[PDB]
Amino acid sequence: SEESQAFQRQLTALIGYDVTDVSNVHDDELEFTRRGLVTPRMAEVASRDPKLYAMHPWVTSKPLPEYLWKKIANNCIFIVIHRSTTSQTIKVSPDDTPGAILQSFFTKMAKDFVLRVCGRDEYLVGETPIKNFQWVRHCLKNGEEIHVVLDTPPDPALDEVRKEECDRKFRVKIRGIDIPVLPRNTDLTVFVEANIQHGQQVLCQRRTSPKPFTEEVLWNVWLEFSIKIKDLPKGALLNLQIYCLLYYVNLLLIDHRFLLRRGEYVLHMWQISGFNADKLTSATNPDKENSMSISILLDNHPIARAEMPNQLRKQLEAIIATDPLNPLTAEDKELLWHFRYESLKHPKAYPKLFSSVKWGQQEIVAKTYQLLARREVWDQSALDVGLTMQLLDCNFSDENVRAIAVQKLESLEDDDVLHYLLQLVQAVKFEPYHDSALARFLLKRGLRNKRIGHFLFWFLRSEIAQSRHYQQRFAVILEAYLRGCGTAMLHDFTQQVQVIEMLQKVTLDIKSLSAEKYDVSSQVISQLKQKLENLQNSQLPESFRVPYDPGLKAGALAIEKCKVMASKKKPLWLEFKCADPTALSNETIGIIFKHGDDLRQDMLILQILRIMESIWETESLDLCLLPYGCISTGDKIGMIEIVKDATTIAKIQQSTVGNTGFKDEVLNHWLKEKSPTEEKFQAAVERFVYSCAGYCVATFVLGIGDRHNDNIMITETGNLFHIDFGHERVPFVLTPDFLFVMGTSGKKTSPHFQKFQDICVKAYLALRHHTNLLIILFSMMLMTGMPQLTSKEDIEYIRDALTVGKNEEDAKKYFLDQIEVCRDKGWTVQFNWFLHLVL
């Protein structure tokens, strides 16, 4: 049609990439994926309750943790129900329904509606106990009152979706390679390596002879492998590399239509700088003008009881108990394979088992599927996210093996899907094909829930903007999502994109006019305000949802309170007025806009933090972390949440001690002068003990504990929290100032410091109870998040940190000793933090 052209246009602007582009394609897998994802979408749209979809209730089935019942010490909950100007407080029990509460509301003054959190696009509806609403738990946790307004339900009509309308050995001919520029130092030789991969597992390998590295190198040679065409497993990759390692590129030997690849190919390769998710991409380099390319020719098609002994059983069991990052011996794999039917009764063995399958053998793969048809135990096992995620990493390229993983993710409630959403999305980079069970699962959960949807939107867009390796695949999935999110969602996303797009341009100009010079003169500031003026016109929409806090609406830009931060790069400090008239405080929305930072890395670390908090919750612990909002918008650019009433530990030191000169009492002096009442000061000290322990443990496990004072912040309310995760020593930061606040100094003791040590321990061994989940999240984060990671050393850290193997007593001890090293170090490391990072 005609209106379809314009619609595809808006989507292109929403996605940040034109999915109809074919300038970098060698087949039609993307188009095929755009077609195949139409069904999954339509089915979910037609299946979703238009009333619950519009009001996105945010609930959870988990029990209220012990630390929250402590608040409700009267089996009564207080909810302030506003109206227009007159508010009315109603007492309610933990198991009531917002409807019941609604009715029990007109019973107080009898002389259609729904409860909405004041100043927030959050509703309290549906057949659910009020104790199970996230906002209620949020208020209960932060000792805040529950204020809700009585208004009309959103008109679901606004969510309207727009109507749519051989048994021979395999071989490859390496014709040659060619690259535009060449003039480099040495004149070394060069050769092309060809590997048939599958799950990071190199099945077969061939190489060409070396040759003078010229602008164009030809071989016109057939590389025949010792593997039959019939034996190539679906998902298998033809991995091509150039050594003289400089360039790589991959090609699926089997396409999306179960067909063998064939014909002439000219693939533009990816380079390498000074093992990682990009290494596995089937996409080719879009830069044809300066990129290396390789020519090949594919010329070669359908795709078709004994009880285990006592001693061996003990062996298999040791293997199974082993940590995920522990390598399997040839004998381990034969044991696991030959006794596969026994292995099948141990869900925690699956990864090991499937990584013991000889995928380069048709008969073995064939038996594996027969094995998988004996699911029973797996289908009934209690869902284990750690286990599930492992079957979705780089080590498994089989569609069916991965499918069962997804099958388990299907049980997760919205609340959990949100906890792992970013890692689930990142795992799509491990899928051999564009359209996969994981992609459909994500597409469906997002379409099914506005909150999940909102984030799915930003998370996919984050990759599409900065990842040439996967933006094509991710763009197609984001499109498929936008086409069924609903017109209202589409409107909100448009509002947000326009604002960030406008702020990105503003930050660029401003950033330019000031190198590595910490100044921020009235000149740059003026020119900063000047631009916001223009935007304050018919550009910056009336409002927009805060990307990291979908419930909040940002209004006009309070240009007055806006400025530029001193920081090394050029942060943009903006403040907005809440767009909702029913908001509680006149409080402004603070958001920082930065450029020149690996914001995706911070996103990863913040989600892991939110995950450790949930783990501790399952064990009645509230380490008080503070994983502030952070969304990566483009390459090194994105926005950050500004916590209210917080400064760096450094700036507090700078306040008294002076410029670069470190005192032990400064911190405590600061908290006491910021606390309105002794009661609050004591509560602030208590919050400090908790937040300090949570970050010491959390940061140690993630190996980002050795930090400079300027990257650690604290609220006037006593909440300590690290920031700037974007990539002698110490395990974590526990300096004399932190200790003094706890009432200790110089290897002494105190009621608070002792509390701190026990909490740490209790917390530390709570993360160990989930050693596998953490190892797997840490392992995936590195491959898909940071630049390059060691296929050993790097990942291996988390294992030593999680003291794998030791018992709780040795672990408790191990951690306490780490607490002592910090005690020994005092101000050493901090003072040293001027030099640089290494080791």
From Swiss-Prot:
One of its GO terms (molecular function) is protein serine/threonine kinase activity. Residues 703-711 are annotated as: Catalytic loop. The gene is PIK3CG. Candidate target in therapy for inflammatory diseases. Selective inhibitors and protein ablation are anti-inflammatory in multiple disease models such as asthma, rheumatoid arthritis, allergy, systemic lupus erythematosus, airway inflammation, lung injury and pancreatitis. PROSITE patterns: C2_PI3K, PI3_4_KINASE_1, PI3_4_KINASE_2, PI3_4_KINASE_3, PI3K_ABD, PI3K_RBD, PIK_HELICAL. Keywords: Angiogenesis, ATP-binding, Cell membrane, Chemotaxis, Cytoplasm, Disease variant, Endocytosis, Immunity, Inflammatory response, Kinase, Lipid metabolism, Membrane, Nucleotide-binding, Phosphoprotein, Serine/threonine-protein kinase, Transferase. The keyword Protein transport does not apply. One of its GO terms (cellular component) is cytoplasm. This is Phosphatidylinositol 4,5-bisphosphate 3-kinase catalytic subunit gamma isoform. Residues 166-299 form the C2 PI3K-type domain. Gene3D superfamilies: 3.10.20.770, C2 domain, Phosphatidylinositol 3-/4-kinase, catalytic domain, Phosphatidylinositol 3-kinase Catalytic Subunit, Chain A, domain 4, Phosphatidylinositol 3-kinase, accessory domain (PIK). Its EC number is 2.7.1.137, 2.7.1.153, 2.7.1.154, 2.7.11.1. GO terms for biological process: adaptive immune response; angiogenesis; cell migration; cellular response to cAMP; dendritic cell chemotaxis; endocytosis; G protein-coupled receptor signaling pathway; hepatocyte apoptotic process. It catalyses: a 1,2-diacyl-sn-glycero-3-phospho-(1D-myo-inositol) + ATP = a 1,2-diacyl-sn-glycero-3-phospho-(1D-myo-inositol-3-phosphate) + ADP + H(+); a 1,2-diacyl-sn-glycero-3-phospho-(1D-myo-inositol-4,5-bisphosphate) + ATP = a 1,2-diacyl-sn-glycero-3-phospho-(1D-myo-inositol-3,4,5-trisphosphate) + ADP + H(+); a 1,2-diacyl-sn-glycero-3-phospho-(1D-myo-inositol 4-phosphate) + ATP = a 1,2-diacyl-sn-glycero-3-phospho-(1D-myo-inositol-3,4-bisphosphate) + ADP + H(+); L-seryl-[protein] + ATP = O-phospho-L-seryl-[protein] + ADP + H(+). Residues 558-827 form the PI3K/PI4K catalytic domain. Belongs to the PI3/PI4-kinase family. ATP binds at residues 590-599, 625-633, 721-727. Pancreas, skeletal muscle, liver and heart. The modification Phosphothreonine is found at residue 771. Pfam families: PI3_PI4_kinase, PI3K_C2, PI3K_rbd, PI3Ka, PIK3CG_ABD. Heterodimer of a catalytic subunit PIK3CG and a PIK3R5 or PIK3R6 regulatory subunit. Interacts with GRK2 through the PIK helical domain. Interaction with GRK2 is required for targeting to agonist-occupied receptor. Interacts with PDE3B; regulates PDE3B activity and thereby cAMP levels in cells. Interacts with TPM2. Interacts with EPHA8; regulates integrin-mediated cell adhesion to substrate. Interacts with HRAS; the interaction is required for membrane recruitment and beta-gamma G protein dimer-dependent activation of the PI3K gamma complex PIK3CG:PIK3R6. It comes from the Eukaryota. Activated by both the alpha and the beta-gamma G proteins following stimulation of G protein-coupled receptors (GPCRs). Activation by GPCRs is assisted by the regulatory subunits (PIK3R5 or PIK3R6) leading to the translocation from the cytosol to the plasma membrane and to kinase activation. Inhibited by AS-604850 and AS-605240. Phosphoinositide-3-kinase (PI3K) that phosphorylates PtdIns(4,5)P2 (Phosphatidylinositol 4,5-bisphosphate) to generate phosphatidylinositol 3,4,5-trisphosphate (PIP3). PIP3 plays a key role by recruiting PH domain-containing proteins to the membrane, including AKT1 and PDPK1, activating signaling cascades involved in cell growth, survival, proliferation, motility and morphology. Links G-protein coupled receptor activation to PIP3 production. Involved in immune, inflammatory and allergic responses. Modulates leukocyte chemotaxis to inflammatory sites and in response to chemoattractant agents. Its main location: cytoplasm.
